[PDB]
Amino acid sequence: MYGLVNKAIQDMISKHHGEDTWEAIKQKAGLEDIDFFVGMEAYSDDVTYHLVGAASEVLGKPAEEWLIAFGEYWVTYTSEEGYGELLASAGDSLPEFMENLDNLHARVGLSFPQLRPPAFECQHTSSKSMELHYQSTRCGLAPMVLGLLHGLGKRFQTKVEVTQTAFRETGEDHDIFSIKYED
């Protein structure tokens, strides 16, 4: 993934647990030689998955739990590190934002030429619920999606209830979530 993602990971760990913890995680992930991540540079996805795994071990959290926190963090990170207006432009409610997400990544993809963005499709079941289809070229990121949804809930001051109903890993087509939301 682009370096931006790996910077966000470093920033979250550093902010929440301090530099020493970050250094131990970076070492454990096999990344000691990397002085810094370059935000607009493409990295092997392996870099990210190794950080997740190292973080899980060092912190003693399940990786899924950690990815949820990271997904929630991304919503704040992007808004603060150069993508605040882009985020704002994607809307002011959760369902509108999710409808706009493919278009938001299309916009990101203008600047990040090698982007492999997720694809999100909403099927609205009422004015307060939807089925969310999450399609990706990557494995294992559903828990990050769960966190992202909670970050968006906070962003829009909306209570979000999210349950995963289909699993990419289990050999189903793609991840699906049922979501209820209320002001």
Binding-site annotation: residue ranges for heme b: 2, 74, 105, 116, 134, 136, 138
> What stretches of 16-158 adopt beta strand conformation (E)?
119-126, 129-135
Binding-site residues from annotation: 2, 74, 105, 116, 134, 136, 138
The minimum distance between CB 20 and ligand HEM, in angstroms, equals 28
Sign of torsion, CA 72 76 77 83? Answer: positive
Please, what is the angle between helix 142-155 and helix 63-80, to 10°? 40
Rule CB under 6 A: is residue 2 a binding residue for ligand HEM? yes
Instruction: Name the E strands within the chain.
Output: 119-126, 129-135, 159-166, 175-182
Which residue lies nearer to ligand HEM by CB, 36 or 60? 36
Per-residue binding string, ligand HEM, 12-41, x by CB under 6 A, is ------------------------------
Taking the C-alpha atoms of residue 30 and residue 41, their distance in angstroms, rounded to an integer, is 19
Cβ–Cβ under 8 Å, residues 177 and 162: yes
> Residues 53 to 82: which contact ligand HEM by CB under 6 A?
75, 78
Task: Report, in Å, the least distance between residue 125 CB and ligand HEM.
Answer: 19
Answer for which of 22, 73, 112, 156 binds ligand HEM (CB under 6 A) is 112
Q: What Å distances lie between residue 27 and 23, 68, 71, 81, 166, CA to CA?
A: 6, 23, 23, 25, 35
Please report, as ranges, the residues that interact with ligand HEM according to CB under 6 A.
1-2, 4-5, 75, 78, 83, 86-87, 101, 105, 108, 112, 115-118, 136-138, 141, 144-145, 148
